[PDB]
Design a protein around this ligand. Sequence first.
Ligand SMILES: C=CC[N@H+](Cc1ccccc1C(=O)N[C@H](C)CC)Cc1ccc2c(c1C(=O)O)OC[C@H](CCC(=O)O)O2
Ligand SMILES: C=CC[N@H+](Cc1ccccc1C(=O)N[C@H](C)CC)Cc1ccc2c(c1C(=O)O)OC[C@H](CCC(=O)O)O2
Ligand SMILES: [Cl-]
Ligand SMILES: [Cl-]
Lengths: 150, 150
Amino acid sequence: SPGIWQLDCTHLEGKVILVAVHVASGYIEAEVIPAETGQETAYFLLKLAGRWPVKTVHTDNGSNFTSTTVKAACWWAGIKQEDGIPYNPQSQGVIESMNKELKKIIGQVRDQAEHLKTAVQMAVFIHNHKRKGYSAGERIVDIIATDIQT
Amino acid sequence: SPGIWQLDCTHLEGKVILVAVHVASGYIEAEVIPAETGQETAYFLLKLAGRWPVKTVHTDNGSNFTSTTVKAACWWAGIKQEDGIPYNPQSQGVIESMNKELKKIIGQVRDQAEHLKTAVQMAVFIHNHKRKGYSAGERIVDIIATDIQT
Ligand SMILES: C=CC[N@H+](Cc1ccccc1C(=O)N[C@H](C)CC)Cc1ccc2c(c1C(=O)O)OC[C@H](CCC(=O)O)O2
Ligand SMILES: C=CC[N@H+](Cc1ccccc1C(=O)N[C@H](C)CC)Cc1ccc2c(c1C(=O)O)OC[C@H](CCC(=O)O)O2
Ligand SMILES: [Cl-]
Ligand SMILES: [Cl-]
């Protein structure tokens, strides 16, 4: 559980926002990319795994699951690449609501930056710091610290 | 000191590697940029502060300290922007040693990627995961979790 992440790809302004969600905490990292490719996804996961102890990634679609570029990055970073089939039907709902929230926040900050990438990073910040009480940033650190003491 | 970070700029292959070091743990995040500008630095700090609870940044030089772009990002993200004067002379030595280590790791992986940015992310991964025994990635989580319980 401490090491499980889910990939999520959403669209805004003709661009693609790639999101990784730490499933247990709801903490996120995100980036804006021109299009989802294997190379973009592979690079994103490499960054993520250097920053948090990523054990398992539930990939966002079959193309990223298949991609030998993505598989090579997961091999390098010691990540178990898994499908993202929503065996628990609540998964679809949670991701959809997260995408909606993120787009809402992006609109609220959209005027405080020229470029979408900036607005997306502002949205990451607001999402991770929002107390709902603890924040997602607090939950992820608490979860992993609890794990390290095991 | 759970919230204290230090900026560090180093050069390789005609490009600039911007590094943020979590002082208490030695955990790092890094990116390759064409040149250090206020905009590049501001965006880097915005990303960092959305991902970790960044209270204070010791800036790497007077230009970034002065930059109104950098000050605006620090204001946005709730970061106290401070100078990076090495009042403790050991800090110069520590940063220089980190730069040398990072460049060594980049050399060791340089063949496993076409692009320097990839190699730098691999270096971040190796640095953060290396047990010295705990890793820097373990130390930062433990430090912050301890703080949250305060
Ligand atoms: C066709 C894939 C390209 N590479 C193949 C490669 C080339 C040479 C040696 C090893 C490997 C190799 O498979 N390496 C190991 C096993 C896995 C990391 C790896 C790679 C992936 C994503 C990137 C990269 C790079 C790069 O080669 O540096 O460069 C930046 C780019 C930025 C995002 C974007 O622009 O899409 O993301
Ligand atoms: C001259 C600065 C430009 N901006 C001024 C600005 C313009 C319009 C509205 C508000 C603000 C403003 O001051 N905003 C708040 C108060 C602080 C975020 C902010 C900004 C900084 C770094 C970036 C940006 C952007 C951007 O405008 O989106 O875009 C991506 C770029 C990528 C790194 C690179 O390419 O150097 O880093
Ligand atoms: Cl946070
Ligand atoms: Cl780690």
